[PDB]
Design a protein around this ligand. Sequence first.
Ligand SMILES: Nc1[nH]c(=O)nc2c1ncn2[C@@H]1O[C@H](CO)[C@@H](O)[C@H]1O
Ligand SMILES: Nc1[nH]c(=O)nc2c1ncn2[C@@H]1O[C@H](CO)[C@@H](O)[C@H]1O
Ligand SMILES: [Zn+2]
Ligand SMILES: [Zn+2]
Lengths: 157, 157
Amino acid sequence: SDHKFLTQAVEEAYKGVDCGDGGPFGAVIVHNNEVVASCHNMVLKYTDPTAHAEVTAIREACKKLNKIELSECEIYASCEPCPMCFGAIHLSRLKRLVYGAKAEAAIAIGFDDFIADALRGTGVYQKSSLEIKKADGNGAAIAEQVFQNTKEKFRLY
Amino acid sequence: SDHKFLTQAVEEAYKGVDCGDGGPFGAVIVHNNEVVASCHNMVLKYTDPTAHAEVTAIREACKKLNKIELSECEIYASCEPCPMCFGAIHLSRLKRLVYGAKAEAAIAIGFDDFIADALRGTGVYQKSSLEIKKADGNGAAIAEQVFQNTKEKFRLY
Ligand SMILES: Nc1[nH]c(=O)nc2c1ncn2[C@@H]1O[C@H](CO)[C@@H](O)[C@H]1O
Ligand SMILES: Nc1[nH]c(=O)nc2c1ncn2[C@@H]1O[C@H](CO)[C@@H](O)[C@H]1O
Ligand SMILES: [Zn+2]
Ligand SMILES: [Zn+2]
């Protein structure tokens, strides 16, 4: 099931840059194999620097399910969530995070050197016990190639 | 000016508690002593766990100025911003953060131990460079009093 939803997130990233909504980032939120939300970065469309793919997906899922906690749900991120998005995933009580590409793949095409300490377990104050899976092989390679594929199609932010 | 806008953020916290919008947290974004945004936590009102006071104020200031960067603006938070909110402040390019109460004041009345390493200077993968001021004296007293005054007046989240 992981490959399918990670692929959906990657396709959301491509779709979002293609229609100009934002950068090449997708996020899918799933409730026991049922897709709750499927979104991409909307920073450009919304004029909202917090409208990353993960935050947008969390907002949509929470509005659809009429609750502020997503503890029965899991999130699939095309790219490793940034500090803001990882904080949002923590606050939303999502129980599992699967992400495709490492943050360095996005940094390689000019994005901020902006990595979540709690995700990589490098913090003093912020800890995390959230189940985190970094994808490997198939979908991981496809997810990593997103930034080289789309870097000519959008403006950095 | 610092005390004025910090007190306004505290007032926003009290207002949001009184109207049931969310928790006792406020945020005021200013541009050269002109208020661009004045907000409080809207998590309960919006059914949105990302709708912290700081994130809400950033969204509204970015809408008000029709741009996704606030490099000319400063933010005043009633309480020390959480990791999600501090990441949002980073992405917003806000030039200065003034916060009133340490996060322990909010933890002491039931909120998560959820502290931003990059704000306290203990981050490894996240390094802020914006100017940060922790309020002292009367501002600190007011901000800390927020949490004892609003105890059991709102619903925890
Ligand atoms: N929709 C999104 N979701 C997310 O988590 N991060 C995003 C993002 N759009 C751009 N970024 C930046 O990507 C780099 C590596 O994470 C960091 O510089 C981030 O600021
Ligand atoms: N509107 C808000 N803005 C913010 O930054 N943090 C908020 C918050 N509402 C609750 N919190 C929690 O307060 C504690 C210390 O910050 C952490 O547990 C946070 O999760
Ligand atoms: Zn993010
Ligand atoms: Zn916050």
